């Protein structure tokens, strides 16, 4: 319950739209009650007055009341649905901005241990569930409470022992029944998520291992084991529905006990007078209508457990500590940087124009993670342009380094916004000039700069994504460029183009390249071979090839 | 669209298993409308006695007793009806999940591999369980929504026909206006369908690519993209909801108009302002309470049906991907009844195979080869050249139109149950489905002594790292072999291959995706285990193939060269060029 505190504080941004959506939920739900209890009294007063009372009974005030209560119940529900859903989409926006601003400082490192794809599908699902806290928990529970307190206060102007009996019954089942059924269904609700995720692990094992099981003859012995988990899983779901059946049967008997008591207790007398003619039906029709307030109240408290669970997963994930801290020194962006590296325990110095190639023996490269400050090194110091790497703020670090990832991410946006990612300020022609130079010709056809890429649009190929990563790295020009196996799983007819693109496009830059492929290393100054995080030999292609060494065997 | 007509007919066809449960729930929804009428009749009669005739409560103990009794029967047929409805939807999911798993086990590994194992779990878990509320809640409510309202009208008509026309007069009006509104709600849901589908996966896209936003300095400028794409999502889906909350508000308007009109008509007819509606027998108070208690109950069935109408959509979406799956025309490899009793290394001769996927596409073209008993062979080639498709065809997982005669008997005439008794094999990925690491190894022989059990362990060099595990031999094999490494998960696959005598041994790529050390360990075990019987291997490690009897290089599913390794290594053929390819990479 204290888990929801960071997210309930997010509600203060839209406190008037969130409260108005509840105020309308009460006005609607009091007009439902008030329309049926005013009708029930009007029929009783009219019947008692009879034909003789046609001129002494003021029937225009109740008639104008049932018309008002019918209009505000009809239109109160419409605006309650609009205001409560508009405010739910403004909480969702504020939840996503809040949880994206917190997952950025811990982007590569904090989320490393979690396998992604399922972690992020859990993050999107948890943020959505934290959005249901208002419509599905707060609005029904708070609305039910103050509707009971208004019909209990309102009815107390007629009789106290009757208003506190209908109010007592209604308010006792608002506070006791929802928790007592969460406790009863707590055991079978976790015996449900155990037997479901157990069936899922026995199913993918039976499906993935279908070749191994079929040939070793165990595909049927493991099918009945899978079918015995479903049999146990379908008994846990049956036990859960046998508690929802009891919840609804009991709620029908509590609303029955309120009607019976009002029929019996209000027959003796409402207030002072015995034989109260039309006041019996004002109480028995309030008891009949007022249990619509408590209709959504047990599923509101039940769903609250899921919100608290999601409020912990999001909170424990976004309250981690960022591995690296960037100091806001406001250092100006450097130019023609000369990366020097010592005891990181490799040591290697890259001058301000050298095209280093690193031949690691056959995931994401660890040396490039430290250069982009994914995490600080434990052993040595990294210096960009005779200044420590940690001395540069985030804004300047992202501007003196232009890395191509091994995993090129194709954002769902247009082709223009996949290139404006690198340089926001570039004009539209610049994107067209560089999409040609790189060889990305098929993209520019049929108005491609507005074409949708990524999910929901056209997918690029492996050799065509690699040209997009280099397109960003060239638009976001920086003195230091960190290639990460740019030619990997790539066609030989285009691998030469990528390498030739690297040599001519990024000639006046401090290119550092990490690969395991030997093609086109003759144009790379100071080739470095690296094994188990250790530098064996260094030197130009000619120098490293003449002397016997690790480069020679491979060549 | 005829898609919904075909899907909703499929859903109705899958409900025959639970026809008994859907007939009881239809019968219990008709009793519930009888008790609603009875409960409103006793309440109206007690109230009339106390208000009009001024009868004390202690003289009405019989109508109170009968009223308490209907209130208890109503709660009983609601508890009963909630549990009958569950059995309706359970027996349908249990009988469809059995059909999905039967079609998925018969289709074999050839078709299962097409989609990720998490794509199949969505179909078998998420999609099948999405059809529960359609049968448990929506279908029972769709019948209660037409019975109970007609019972209400039939019960009020003898008492008063003007009160029975207020409720009935809105029966044609309610769907006439929802359909009139609904056709305006399909306009806004059509010109926003695409823009709202690109904005839904926008958060996950910006969240799956935070590494690219980090390394370009765009993390802060993709918060103004979340703010803009969430504002646009709201202002575009609130447009749709302004037309979908009107449709729900048509029923609330006619619910409110009917209760107001019942009150005003009865209230005015008691004072003489109105003189129609009754049968000239005088309008009583119990006739106005009966119509007023039952006025909100007329529309309740329709209002509950409006909260279940989503359960028809997610059960048509689920029935969509469950009907395409169940009607794929995929054809299975035919199973003979002959039995191979040689119990010794078998000879594989093959000509004009044309091995085909279950979908009917041809995977390996014209294949012509022979394999004498006990002679190891190796398949080499490029990625996507149909090297593995021959191994699957020899296992029986794929269909071939040609001649694949093993030991003189064609494969398609050989019973699969007995053929796989002489077959052991090691795939690129060691799928371990058993419980414990010892149960993975004992999967081949469910009952064997520890002497040969240990013999098959150390021979595969799995005993090397047993003390490293927390429990040793009986270490609990984690799901997807998470506890083990990929290197250790491979040597345990080798252990069960060696444990059972095999008349043919098929290695897919046992050394691929291995670490430094285990790569020799798996080869040392297998290279010595490939001699005891006929063997066929597939590999990309071309360095040490100087020992294997024949080299079968293939491209686009056609064996090109043959012969010992030395012959085609320097002959300048495809193999020599393919061997030079490995020299480009370190
Ligand atoms: N069940 C299947 N359904 C459809 N296509 C398939 C199926 N099995 C294989 N293919 C395709 O048919 C071709 C045969 O490739 P494959 O049988 O995997 O040979 P391969 O050499 O083992 N590939 P690789 O493992 O990368 O070396 C490829 O293009 C596959 O994608
Ligand atoms: Mg293969």
Contacts of B203 in chain A (CB under 8 A): 96, 100, 124, 127
Burial of B460 (0-12, 13-18, 19+ CB in 10 A): buried
Burial of A182 (0-12, 13-18, 19+ CB in 10 A): middle
- Is B378 assigned to a binding site? yes
In DSSP terms, which residues pair with A483 in a beta bridge?
A513
CA distance linking residue A302 with residue B231, whole number of Å: 30
Give the side-chain half-sphere CA count within 13 A for B159.
23
Same fold, A4-319 and A339-554: no
At B577, is the secondary structure helix, strand, or coil? helix
- Is A353 assigned to a binding site? no
* Phi and psi at residue A385, to the nearest 5°: 55, 60
Residue list, ligand 1 pocket, CB within 6 Å: B 110, 114, 357, 361, 363, 381, 383-389
User: To one decimal place, what's the resolution in Å?
Assistant: 3.0
Residues 365-424 of chain A whose Cβ lies under 8 A from any Cβ of chain B:
372, 394-395, 398-399, 401, 403, 405, 407, 409, 411-412, 421-422, 424
CA distance linking residue B447 with residue A191, whole number of Å: 33
State the sign of the Cα–Cα–Cα–Cα dihedral A313, A314, A320, A322. Answer: positive
**CA dist B243 to A84, B153, B177, Å?**
15, 30, 12
Write out the two tokens for A439: 């060889």
Start-end ranges of CATH 1.20.1560.10 in chain B?
A: 2-326
| Domain boundaries of chain A, sorted by first residue | 4-319, 339-554
For ligand 1, atom 28, the nearest C-alpha belongs to: B384
**CATH assignment, B2-326:** 1.20.1560.10
CA distance linking residue B572 with residue A532, whole number of Å: 36
Burial of B462 (0-12, 13-18, 19+ CB in 10 A): buried
In DSSP terms, which residues pair with A481 in a beta bridge?
A402, A511
Judged by CB atoms closer than 8 Å, whether chains meet at A100 and B206 is answered as yes
| CATH architecture assignment, domain A4-319 | Up-down Bundle (1.20)
Judged by CB atoms closer than 8 Å, whether chains meet at B198 and A452 is answered as yes
* Phi and psi at residue B97, to the nearest 5°: -65, -25
User: What's the maximum distance between 2 C-alpha atoms anywhere in chain A?
Assistant: 125
Q: Which of B557, B564, B542 is nearest to B375 (CA)?
A: B564
In DSSP terms, which residues pair with B507 in a beta bridge?
B426, B537
Burial of B411 (0-12, 13-18, 19+ CB in 10 A): buried
Identify which ligand lies nearest to the alpha carbon of B555.
1
Q: In this structure, are residues A180 and B386 in contact, taking their beta carbons and an 8 Å threshold?
A: no
Domain A339-554 has CATH 3.40.50.2020: no
Q: In this structure, are residues B534 and B376 in contact, taking their beta carbons and an 8 Å threshold?
A: yes
Return the best residue to mutate from B360, B382, B389 for the ligand 1 pocket (most ligand atoms within 8 A of CB).
B389
In DSSP terms, which residues pair with B504 in a beta bridge?
B423
CA distance linking residue B211 with residue A57, whole number of Å: 77
Q: In this structure, are residues A100 and B219 in contact, taking their beta carbons and an 8 Å threshold?
A: no
Identify which ligand lies nearest to the alpha carbon of B114.
1
Q: In this structure, are residues B162 and B265 in contact, taking their beta carbons and an 8 Å threshold?
A: yes
CA distance linking residue A510 with residue A512, whole number of Å: 6
* Phi and psi at residue A8, to the nearest 5°: -70, -30
At how many degrees (to 10) do helices B223-270 and B173-188 cross?
Answer: 170
Write out the two tokens for A290: 């007022």
Rounded to the nearest angstrom, the distance between the alpha carbon of A287 and the centre of ligand 1 is 70
State the sign of the Cα–Cα–Cα–Cα dihedral B294, B298, B301, B304. Answer: negative
CA distance linking residue B339 with residue A133, whole number of Å: 64
A256 has a chain B CB within 8 A of its CB:
yes
CB atoms within 10 A of CB A362: 7
- Is A50 assigned to a binding site? no
Helices (H), A420-520: 428-437, 441-444, 462-475, 492-505
| DSSP code of residue A517 | B
* Phi and psi at residue A513, to the nearest 5°: -125, 135
**CA dist A65 to A58, A282, B178, B260, B273, Å?**
12, 14, 28, 9, 18
Contacts of B583 in chain A (CB under 8 A): 518, 554
Method: cryo-EM
CB atoms within 10 A of CB B324: 9
Domain B348-584 has CATH 3.40.50.300: yes
Q: What is the residue whose two structure tokens read 């039976």?
A: A206
Q: In this structure, are residues B278 and B194 in contact, taking their beta carbons and an 8 Å threshold?
A: no
Rounded to the nearest angstrom, the distance between the alpha carbon of B555 and the centre of ligand 1 is 12
| DSSP code of residue B455 | H
Three-state SS for B317-338 is HHHHHHHHHHCCCCCCCCCCCE
Rounded to the nearest angstrom, the distance between the alpha carbon of B539 and the centre of ligand 2 is 9
Burial of A511 (0-12, 13-18, 19+ CB in 10 A): buried
Selecting from A107, A452, A455 the residue whose C-beta is nearest the C-beta of B214 gives A107
**CA dist A407 to A398, A510, B474, B531, Å?**
18, 22, 39, 43
CA distance linking residue A70 with residue B295, whole number of Å: 13
At A360, is the secondary structure helix, strand, or coil? strand
Rounded to the nearest angstrom, the distance between the alpha carbon of B390 and the centre of ligand 2 is 10
State the sign of the Cα–Cα–Cα–Cα dihedral B174, B180, B182, B184. Answer: negative
Q: In this structure, are residues A404 and A473 in contact, taking their beta carbons and an 8 Å threshold?
A: yes
- Rounded to the nearest 5 percent, the helix, strand and coil shares of chain B are 60, 10, 30
Write out the two tokens for A293: 């307030």
Write out the two tokens for A488: 């990997």
Q: How many CB pairs under 8 A join A and B?
A: 360
CA distance linking residue A174 with residue A176, whole number of Å: 6
Judged by CB atoms closer than 8 Å, whether chains meet at A411 and B212 is answered as yes
């Amino acid at each position: 319950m204290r888990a929801l505190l960071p997210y309930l504080a997010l509600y203060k941004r839209h406190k008037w739209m969130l409260s108005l959506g509840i105020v309308l939920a009460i006005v609607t739900l009091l007009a439902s009650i008030g329309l049926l209890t005013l009708s029930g009294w009007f029929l009783s007063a009219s019947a008692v007055a009879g034909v003789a009372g046609l001129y002494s009974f003021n029937y225009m005030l109740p008639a104008a009341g049932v018309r008002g209560a019918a209009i505000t119940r009809t239109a109160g529900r419409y605006f309650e649905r609009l205001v409560s859903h508009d405010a739910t989409f403004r909480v969702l926006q504020h939840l996503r901005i809040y949880t994206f601003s917190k997952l950025l400082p811990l982007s590569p490192a904090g989320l490393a241990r979690y396998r992604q794809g399922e972690l992020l599908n859990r993050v999107v699902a948890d943020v959505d569930t934290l959005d249901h806290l208002y419509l599905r928990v707060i609005s029904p529970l708070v609305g039910a409470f103050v509707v009971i307190m208004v019909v209990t206060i309102g009815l107390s102007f007629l009789d106290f022992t009757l208003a506190f009996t209908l109010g007592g019954i209604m308010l006792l089942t608002l506070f006791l029944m929802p928790p007592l059924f969460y406790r009863a269904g707590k055991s079978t609700g976790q015996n449900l998520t155990h037997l479901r995720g157990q069936y899922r692990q026995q199913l993918t094992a039976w499906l993935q291992g279908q070749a191994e099981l079929t040939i070793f003859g165990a595909s049927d012995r493991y099918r009945t084991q899978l079918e015995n988990t479903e049999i146990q899983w379908l008994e846990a779901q049956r036990r859960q529905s046998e508690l929802t059946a009891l919840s609804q049967a009991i709620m029908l008997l509590i609303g029955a006990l309120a009607v019976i008591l009002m029929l019996w207790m209000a027959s003796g007398g409402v207030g002072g007078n015995a034989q109260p003619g039309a006041l019996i039906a004002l109480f028995v029709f309030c008891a009949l209508a007022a249990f619509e307030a408590l209709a959504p109240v047990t599923g509101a408290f039940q769903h609250l457990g899921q919100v608290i669970a999601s409020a912990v997963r999001i909170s424990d994930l976004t309250d981690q500590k960022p591995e690296v801290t960037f100091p806001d020194t406001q250092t100006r962006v450097a130019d023609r940087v000369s990366l020097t590296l010592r005891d990181v325990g490799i040591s290697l110095q890259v001058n301000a124009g050298e095209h280093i190639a690193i031949l690691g023996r056959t995931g994401k490269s660890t040396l490039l993670q430290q250069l982009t400050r994914a995490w600080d090194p434990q052993q040595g110091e990294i210096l960009l342009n005779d200044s420590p790497i940690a001395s540069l703020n985030e804004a300047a670090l992202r501007q003196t380094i232009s890395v191509v990832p091994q995993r090129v991410h194709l954002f769902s946006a247009t082709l223009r916004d996949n290139l404006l990612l690198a340089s926001p300020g570039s004009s539209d022609e610049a994107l067209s000039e560089i999409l040609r130079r790189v060889g990305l010709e098929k993209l520019l056809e049929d108005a491609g700069l507005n074409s949708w890429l990524g999910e929901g649009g056209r997918q690029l190929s492996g050799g065509e994504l690699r040209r997009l990563a280099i397109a960003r790295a060239l638009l976001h020009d920086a003195p230091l460029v960190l290639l990460d196996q740019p030619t990997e799983g790539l066609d030989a007819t285009t691998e030469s183009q990528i390498l030739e693109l690297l040599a001519e496009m990024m000639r006046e830059k401090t290119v550092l390249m990490v690969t395991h492929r030997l093609r086109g290393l003759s144009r790379f100054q100071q080739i470095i071979v690296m094994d188990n995080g250790q530098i064996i030999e260094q030197g130009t292609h000619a120098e490293l090839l003449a002397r016997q060494g690790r480069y020679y065997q491979f060549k | 669209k005829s898609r919904q007509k075909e899907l909703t007919r499929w859903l109705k066809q899958q409900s025959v298993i639970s026809q008994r449960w859907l007939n009881i729930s239809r019968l219990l929804g008709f009793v519930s409308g009888i008790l609603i009428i009875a409960q409103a009749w006793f309440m109206a009669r007690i109230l009339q006695h106390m208000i009009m005739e001024n009868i004390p409560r202690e003289a009405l103990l019989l109508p109170f007793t009968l009223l308490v009794l209907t209130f208890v029967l109503r709660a009983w047929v609601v508890w009963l009806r909630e549990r009958v409805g569950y059995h309706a939807g359970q027996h349908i999911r249990f009988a469809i999940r059995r059909q999905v798993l039967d079609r998925l086990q018969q289709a074999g590994p050839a078709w299962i591999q097409g989609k990720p194992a998490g794509s199949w779990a969505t179909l078998v878990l998420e999609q099948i369980d999405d059809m529960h509320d359609y049968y448990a809640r929506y279908l029972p409510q769709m019948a209660l929504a037409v019975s109970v309202p007609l019972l209400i009208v039939v019960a009020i008509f003898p008492s008063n026909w003007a009160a029975a026309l207020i409720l009935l007069g809105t029966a044609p009006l309610i769907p006439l206006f929802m359909a009139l509104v609904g056709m305006g709600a399909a306009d806004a849901n059509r010109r926003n369908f695409l823009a709202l589908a690109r904005l839904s996966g926008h958060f996950l896209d910006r969240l799956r690519g935070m590494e690219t936003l980090r390394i370009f300095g765009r993390g802060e400028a993709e918060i103004e993209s979340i703010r803009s794409a969430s504002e646009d999502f709201r202002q575009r889906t609130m447009e749709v909801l302004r037309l979908a909350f009107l449709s729900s508000g048509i029923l609330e308007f006619f619910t409110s108009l009917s209760i107001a009109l019942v009150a005003v008509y009865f209230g005015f007819s008691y004072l003489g302002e109105l003189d129609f509606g009754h049968y000239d027998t005088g309008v009583t108070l119990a006739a106005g309470f009966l119509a007023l208690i039952l006025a909100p109950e007329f529309f309740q069935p329709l209002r509950d049906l409006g909260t279940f109408y989503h359960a028809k959509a997610q059960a048509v979406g689920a029935a969509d991907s469950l009907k395409t799956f169940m009607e794929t025309p995929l054809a299975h490899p035919q199973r003979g009844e002959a039995e191979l009793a040689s119990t010794d290394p078998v000879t594989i001769e093959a000509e004009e195979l044309f091995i085909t996927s279950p979908e009917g596409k041809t995977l390996a073209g014209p294949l012509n080869f022979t394999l004498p008993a006990g002679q190891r062979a190796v398949l080499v080639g490029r990625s996507g050249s149909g090297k593995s498709s021959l191994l699957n065809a020899l296992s029986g997982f794929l269909s071939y139109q040609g001649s694949l005669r093993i030991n003189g008997i064609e494969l398609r005439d050989l019973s699969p149950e007995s053929w796989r008794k002489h077959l052991s094999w090691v795939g690129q990925n060691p799928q371990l489905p058993a419980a414990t690491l010892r149960d993975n190894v004992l999967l081949a022989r469910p009952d064997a002594s520890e002497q040969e059990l240990q013999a098959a362990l150390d021979n595969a060099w799995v005993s090397e790292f047993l003390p490293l595990l927390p429990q040793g031999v009986d270490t609990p094999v984690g799901d997807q072999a998470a506890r083990l490494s990929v290197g250790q998960a491979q040597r345990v696959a080798v252990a069960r291959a060696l444990l059972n005598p095999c008349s043919l041994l098929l290695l897919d790529e046992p050394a691929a995706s291995l670490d430094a050390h285990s790569e020799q360990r798996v080869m040392e075990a297998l290279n010595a285990a490939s001699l005891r019987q006929t063997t066929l291997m597939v590999t990309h490690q071309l360095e040490d193939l100087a020992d294997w009897d024949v080299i079968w290089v293939m491209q686009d599913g056609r064996i090109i060269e043959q012969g010992r390794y030395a012959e085609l290594s320097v002959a300048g053929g495809p193999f020599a060029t393919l061997l030079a390819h490995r020299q480009e990479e370190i």
